[PDB]
Design a protein around this nucleic acid. Structure first.
Lengths: 244, 244
DNA sequence: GAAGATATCTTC
DNA sequence: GAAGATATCTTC
């Protein structure tokens, strides 16, 4: 499908290429940093051409936000299906040691999921799928060699600020958890699990609708949540007790 | 001085080079996006090797954070002078037009400026200077070639996601304003001005200490601030009335 | 201007 | 766990 094609394209691309720096048109190379502020951006840019290749070959139009801070990174839709859009968002996190638990922030829980037109390229109801391309890299301490510029034929001399980058595509609802991903920035937290649970889709919500509802009624602070619900069990009991 | 040499070196690199993408060790090129989450990271890395070079020419050890959200981007210091460290931060903003007013977020007003050791590589009292390397770009839109990947002999075809980047170096207190630069994430706001005034140093505070005192006592919300002070003027009257 | 969005992590 | 930090922007 588009999806299985996308993931194979993703793994493939990830297996064959290791990003090492930013190149200037004049040919000069600036190495990278080993922090997520850098790598999430790098990984976002690394994905762009892959998603578009695969998308294109499946008859889908690829549209990026024109304005800043509008979900999603990538809006996909067959021209014949304007109301069957697929939102693709790229998220990154790190691991201190290769093979340890990860967790992602899954976007706002007080923005577009609460306001059909807020911070989004197309009204939310126009999307049928919300996919997450999650990159995970193992941190690598910066070396002195990073503080230098490089030439095109010194690429492998350039040090990488990561090790073990693994990628996955999964449905946002299937990887969502019941714990906030951020505090002041009110993000949905994903499940706290190892890379494979994200691939295999080891979620905790029964459907995409349960996901959306839990998050639509999640209170911003623990004080407010402790008198309503704070985890999937208490949500269900809250639904049961009549919402409440 | 380290500073005039830094500013000049910055000017010149920015003048001789245009960042146009990320490069993989294998030579494949993914072009850049047009938002600041990309360009800030890009201008940030661009600056790394320039700052390092000038600091070493001037006999200064350069230190980046080991830790992730620890100011400053660069801690420069002469071995001989451990308590006379200089903090350097790279910040980016954009203009829809080519020469319009700009403003920067100058970092938190509730972290290291309030707790000597919070979110900072070295205690705040070991820094005798806090510099800002500011980048401004005019946003340009495209895609007629941004969603493809290029090869090294193709750097020329790549579209650059910006126009008119300008860079300046200035003491944070000298460009600090009196209005928050962010709400929930509590950032210091710079002055709202033209590129020239930042270069110039057309600030509003009397001294770095007035800058720090204003910001250390700034209430997080307007409700709290309307009963105290909300601008340099009211703050001064507040100092006068006996810090009350 | 004020508050809260964009994404992700560390601190408390 | 919660809350608040990292940086910058848009929305209100």
């Amino acid at each position: 499908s588009l999806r299985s094609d996308l993931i194979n394209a993703l793994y493939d691309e990830n297996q064959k290429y290791d990003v090492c720096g930013i190149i200037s048109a004049e040919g000069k190379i600036y190495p990278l940093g080993s922090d997520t502020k850098v790598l999430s951006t790098i990984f976002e840019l690394f994905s762009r051409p892959i998603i578009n290749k695969i998308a294109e070959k499946h008859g889908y139009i690829v549209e990026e936000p024109k304005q800043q801070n509008h979900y999603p990174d990538f809006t996909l839709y067959k021209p014949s299906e304007p109301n069957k859009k697929i939102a693709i968002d790229i998220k990154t996190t790190y691991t201190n040691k290769e093979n340890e638990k990860i967790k992602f922030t899954l976007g706002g829980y007080t923005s577009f999921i609460r306001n059909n037109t807020k911070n989004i390229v197309y009204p939310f109801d126009q999307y049928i799928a919300h996919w997450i391309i999650g990159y995970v890299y193992t941190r690598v301490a910066t070396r002195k060699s990073s503080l230098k510029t490089y030439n095109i034929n010194e690429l492998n001399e350039i040090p990488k600020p990561y090790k073990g980058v693994k990628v996955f595509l999964q449905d946002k609802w299937v990887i969502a958890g019941d714990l906030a991903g951020s505090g002041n920035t009110t993000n949905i937290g994903s499940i706290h699990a190892h890379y494979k649970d994200f691939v295999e889709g080891k979620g905790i919500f029964d459907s995409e609708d349960e996901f959306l509802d839990y998050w639509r009624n999640y209170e911003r602070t623990s004080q407010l949540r402790n008198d309503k619900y704070n985890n999937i069990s208490e949500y269900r009991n809250w639904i049961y007790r009549g919402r409440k």
